[PDB]
Amino acid sequence: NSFSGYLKLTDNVYIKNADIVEEAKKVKPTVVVNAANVYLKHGGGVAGALNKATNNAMQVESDDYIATNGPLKVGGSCVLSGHNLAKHCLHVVGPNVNKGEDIQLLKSAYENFNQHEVLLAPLLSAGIFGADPIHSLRVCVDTVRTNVYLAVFDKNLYDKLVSSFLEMKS
Ligand SMILES: Nc1ncnc2c1ncn2[C@@H]1O[C@H](COP(=O)(O)OP(=O)(O)OC[C@H]2O[C@@H](O)[C@H](O)[C@@H]2O)[C@@H](O)[C@H]1O
């Protein structure tokens, strides 16, 4: 946990414009969050990017987990190996609002973060799943009480997130 270059938004939320995988390799974090689906299929996005960097070790361990325990709940989580990227990997499932999943569960999904004192995380539901990233950052800041280090990959999205957060801040 040697996080460098993060802007601090609140007492426990930090943000940085980085690739979450490059971040993980460099910082070797205790916990890296994966933006997961219910069957733990890491195709594309953060999940696929992380899986590739373990040369598909993650996807194999994931598939064994689903086979034993069945799908995760939307808004739920499971802790697996972090492989070469971290000690552990917390797969957290946020609502796919694009497919009509309840946006309320984004808050339950962020509540999983509070079981770890330090995390390297992306924004849940803010890509393929279609939530407003500003909304997702807002619920993260309102929900997570532990120290979360957000890697936002796209520069324009990151700029807009730090702007909007600080304009609406109180
Ligand atoms: N390499 C990356 N590094 C950092 N942030 C990233 C990266 N790739 C995407 N992001 C950002 O992380 C946030 C989450 O994007 P997704 O990974 O698409 O997350 P989510 O919306 O929860 O999508 C879940 C779905 O995506 C699939 O990969 C996954 O298997 C599941 O089906 C968004 O802001 C997105 O721009």
Curated annotation (Swiss-Prot):
It is found in: Host endoplasmic reticulum membrane. The lineage of its organism: Viruses, Riboviria, Orthornavirae, Pisuviricota, Pisoniviricetes. It catalyses: Thiol-dependent hydrolysis of ester, thioester, amide, peptide and isopeptide bonds formed by the C-terminal Gly of ubiquitin (a 76-residue protein attached to proteins as an intracellular targeting signal). This is Papain-like protease nsp3. Responsible for the cleavages located at the N-terminus of the replicase polyprotein. Participates together with nsp4 in the assembly of virally-induced cytoplasmic double-membrane vesicles necessary for viral replication. Antagonizes innate immune induction of type I interferon by blocking the phosphorylation, dimerization and subsequent nuclear translocation of host IRF3. Also prevents host NF-kappa-B signaling. In addition, PL-PRO possesses a deubiquitinating/deISGylating activity and processes both 'Lys-48'- and 'Lys-63'-linked polyubiquitin chains from cellular substrates. Inhibited in vitro by GRL-0617. It comes from the Viruses. The chain holds residues 1026 to 1195 of 4405 of the full protein. It is a multi-pass membrane protein. Residues 1-169 form the Macro domain. May form homohexamers. Interacts with N protein.
